[PDB]
């Protein structure tokens, strides 16, 4: 009997059986309803397109993400996505397989309670367990200490763990992630002539960001160079022709992560939030966290982030301590790989929430010592 | 057939086989339970880290000394420490070896009774004996006369002995010791900005005290010198960088030994209690005690204590008598050396408390002539 490790996240759903190397099914987490009229009758027209189909027929659909910032805001779309994931992407009945969901830290409790209630009443799974999204990322590296910054697509959270003991009072969460970077890129692309407004084109802007953006090592000199020379201006092809040429917008959109004053947010960049979460920890385990910093999440896949982070942390941290930034090549699937490893352990077999316990205590069972 | 010379102490448990010159294992007497939550599974993390293993994980533990001032306040912790010492640090079964423990003078008798009862009931040792902590140090030096000042870590006592005869009526005990010096150093180090509150940082302050603090020959003169010159400015590297600068605080910590009014004590200093004890004994052996003054305990390893103490005693003593201070370099292990010597003596082979004697008279046999 294998275990199902689903990882909803916010933007990409990754699912696959426990004990594998890569998730078997990965697809964007969007539900797209049509908005036009429709004149041909009997064309097999559906009432809602979910999964990766909705970004293939995205011309006449209005894609609407069901998760804004970690929290789930539209439960009907989430139920649609879970149903499509179980029955059509893996074709496995949910009533004969345990489930391992992942939840961002410092989420509202109602989210977890409703997730448990839906998973136990609608899909009728035998037993499901919810885990913090960064602990599995740390599991993936094979270590037992370190501070992991899982800058996902919806929310960016920085969790330090030492010798398997997490520090709840030093968890730093910031709501700047890939979605706000995409929105800022779409806003600054109007400075050159191209205007994207409808939700269908936000996917195009997202693809442009994924394909062209890069994080500068130093910002001032690069900005000075890009405004004088012409070696950074790169071209891209839109899905109807009409090639565009992006200049200094390549490294200015990802710069927001290290300087959130662009979007008016109050907090500091991710290079200072990590140091602040480190300094909140006790004085004895700062050296080990300095030497064992770990990166994760899709949005940390930008070419040129591991060196900028190293330079900024070296600037902030004391000079004598050695600073190492772990960046595995498989950063995108690190959380799911950790979940697959966790679901295969023998000692984990008694941590699941038995359906009997839910029937006895209700959906609030998740908040108990049974996490 | 070999004898075990154990030294409980308070802070540094030292143990080893009899007849040697160095103890086998010297490790801190600390038992530290975890304090945080703990998220990673399968680490096999124990619920109690003791001894030297616990001083490597101080970040996620609450180190706690089971001995406040000589006496034992948590018998469960002391049982854990004894089990760890006998079974793991020596790899010697306790069932076929005698035991020689040490006790500070003028302590409650219930402590010795409970110690012997636990040693004979749980461990089932063949025979055990409790010896005075200072008489062993005096025996170790190869002499038989004089007054020994044993500035340990929990209790500081003065024991005068003449030609193998002790004087129970002239024993002066004060509870000022290295622990109070560490606390006072921590209290005064906040005047510059460096604040230590966590029980784990106490060990950092203790290491600072061991590596930096020293006894000034003249207190007021040195303090005036430090206010104008800058040769006392000493730098130290914290376990995470951010070096600190200690000025005149380095010789205020051991100045408490001579002026206990710093920590609120109404009693006199160490050089004065010894003088009072010497003047309390017979008038016929005062010169011999002057000629055989020997220091004991690790705390007497401060740089320059034997010179200021000699000067103070010479000033207080009559000008005719000659004052000499015997300061062996290995004063830290002197008690264990004395125990090793005593365990090897053939004349001492019949002073042990046999198992039959305990089964016949109970734990109260300790208070008898057989200590």
């Amino acid at each position: 009997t294998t275990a199902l490790v689903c990882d909803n996240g916010s933007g990409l759903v990754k699912a696959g059986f426990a004990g594998d190397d890569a998730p078997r099914a990965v697809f964007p987490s969007i539900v797209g309803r049509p908005r036009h009229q429709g004149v041909m009758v009997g064309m097999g027209q559906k009432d809602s397109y979910v999964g990766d189909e909705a970004q293939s027929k995205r011309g006449i659909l209005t894609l609407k993400y069901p998760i804004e910032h970690g929290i789930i805001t539209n439960w009907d779309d989430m139920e649609k996505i879970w149903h499509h994931t179980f029955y059509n992407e893996l074709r496995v009945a949910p009533e004969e397989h345990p489930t391992l969901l992942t939840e961002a830290p410092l989420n509202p409790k109602a989210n977890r309670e409703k997730m448990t209630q839906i998973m136990f009443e609608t899909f009728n799974v035998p037993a499901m367990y919810v885990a913090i999204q960064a602990v599995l990322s740390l599991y993936a590296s094979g270590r037992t200490t370190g501070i992991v910054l899982d800058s996902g697509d919806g929310v960016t959270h920085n969790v330090p763990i030492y010798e398997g003991y997490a520090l709840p009072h030093a968890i730093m969460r910031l709501d700047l992630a890939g979605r706000d970077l995409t929105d800022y890129l779409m806003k600054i692309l109007t400075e050159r002539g191209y205007s994207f407004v409808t939700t269908a084109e936000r996917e195009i802007v997202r693809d442009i960001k994924e394909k062209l953006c890069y994080v500068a090592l130093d910002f001032e000199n690069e900005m000075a160079t890009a405004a004088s020379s012409s070696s950074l201006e790169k071209s891209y092809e839109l899905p109807d022709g009409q090639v565009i040429t992006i200049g200094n917008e390549r490294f200015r959109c990802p710069e927001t992560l290290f300087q959130p004053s662009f979007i008016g947010m109050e907090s500091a960049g991710i290079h200072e939030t990590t140091y602040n979460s480190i300094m909140k920890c006790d004085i004895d385990i700062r050296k080990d966290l300095y030497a064992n910093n770990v990166l994760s999440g899709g949005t940390t896949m930008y070419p040129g982030i591991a060196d900028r982070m190293q330079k900024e942390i070296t600037a902030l941290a004391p000079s004598t301590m050695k600073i190492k930034i772990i960046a595995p090549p498989e950063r995108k699937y690190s959380v799911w790989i950790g979940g697959s490893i966790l679901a295969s352990l023998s000692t984990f077999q008694q941590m699941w929430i038995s359906k009997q316990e839910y029937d006895e205590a209700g959906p609030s069972i998740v908040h108990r010592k049974c996490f | 057939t070999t004898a075990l010379v154990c030294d409980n102490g308070s802070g540094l448990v030292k143990a080893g086989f009899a007849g040697d010159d160095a103890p086998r294992a010297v490790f801190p007497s600390i038992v530290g339970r975890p304090r945080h939550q703990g998220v990673m599974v399968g680490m096999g993390q124990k619920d109690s880290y003791v001894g030297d293993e616990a001083q490597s994980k101080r970040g996620i533990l609450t180190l706690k000394y089971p001995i406040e001032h000589g006496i034992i306040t948590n018998w469960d912790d002391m049982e854990k420490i004894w089990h760890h010492t006998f079974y793991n640090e020596l790899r010697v079964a306790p069932e076929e070896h005698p035991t020689l423990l040490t006790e500070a003078p003028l302590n409650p008798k219930a402590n010795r009774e409970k110690m012997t009862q636990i040693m004979f009931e749980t461990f089932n040792v063949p025979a055990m004996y409790v010896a005075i902590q200072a008489v062993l140090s005096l025996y170790a030096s190869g002499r038989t006369t004089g007054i020994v000042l044993d500035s340990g870590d929990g209790v500081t006592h003065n024991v005068p002995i003449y030609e193998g005869y002790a004087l129970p009526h002239a024993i002066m005990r004060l509870d000022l010791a290295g622990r109070d010096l560490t606390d006072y150093l921590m209290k005064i180090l906040t005047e510059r900005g460096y604040s230590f509150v966590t029980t784990a940082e106490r060990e950092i302050v203790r290491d600072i005290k061991e590596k930096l603090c020293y006894v000034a020959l003249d207190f007021e003169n040195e303090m005036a010198t430090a206010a104008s010159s800058s040769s006392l400015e000493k730098s130290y590297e914290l376990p995470d960088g951010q070096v600190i600068t200690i000025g005149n605080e380095r010789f205020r910590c051991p100045e408490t030994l001579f002026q206990p009014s710093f920590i609120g004590m109404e009693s006199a200093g160490i050089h004065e209690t010894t003088y009072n004890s010497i003047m309390k004994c017979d008038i016929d052996i005062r010169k011999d005690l002057y000629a055989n003054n020997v220091l004991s305990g690790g705390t007497t390893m401060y740089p320059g204590i034997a010179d200021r103490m000699q000067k103070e005693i010479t000033a207080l003593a009559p000008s005719t008598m000659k004052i000499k201070i015997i300061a062996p370099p290995e004063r830290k292990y002197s008690v264990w050396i004395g125990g090793s010597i005593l365990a090897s003596l053939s004349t001492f082979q019949q002073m042990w408390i046999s198992k039959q004697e305990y089964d016949e008279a109970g734990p109260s046999i300790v208070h008898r002539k057989c200590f």
């Binding site: 190397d21 599991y139 993936a140 590296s141 094979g142 270590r143 037992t144 398997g164 997490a166 709840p168 490893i341 352990l345 023998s346 000692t347 008694q350 941590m351 108990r368 010592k369 049974c370 996490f371 | 939550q37 703990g38 998220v39 990673m40 599974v41 399968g42 680490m43 096999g44 993390q45």
Partner: peptide, 20 residues
């Protein structure tokens, strides 16, 4: 209470090497 990890034995950091 937080998720009290049940008492097991081991292991880690061999899986990463195996995977690589």
């Amino acid at each position: 209470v937080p998720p009290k990890i049940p008492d097991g034995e081991r292991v880690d950091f061999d899986d990463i090497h195996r995977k690589r």
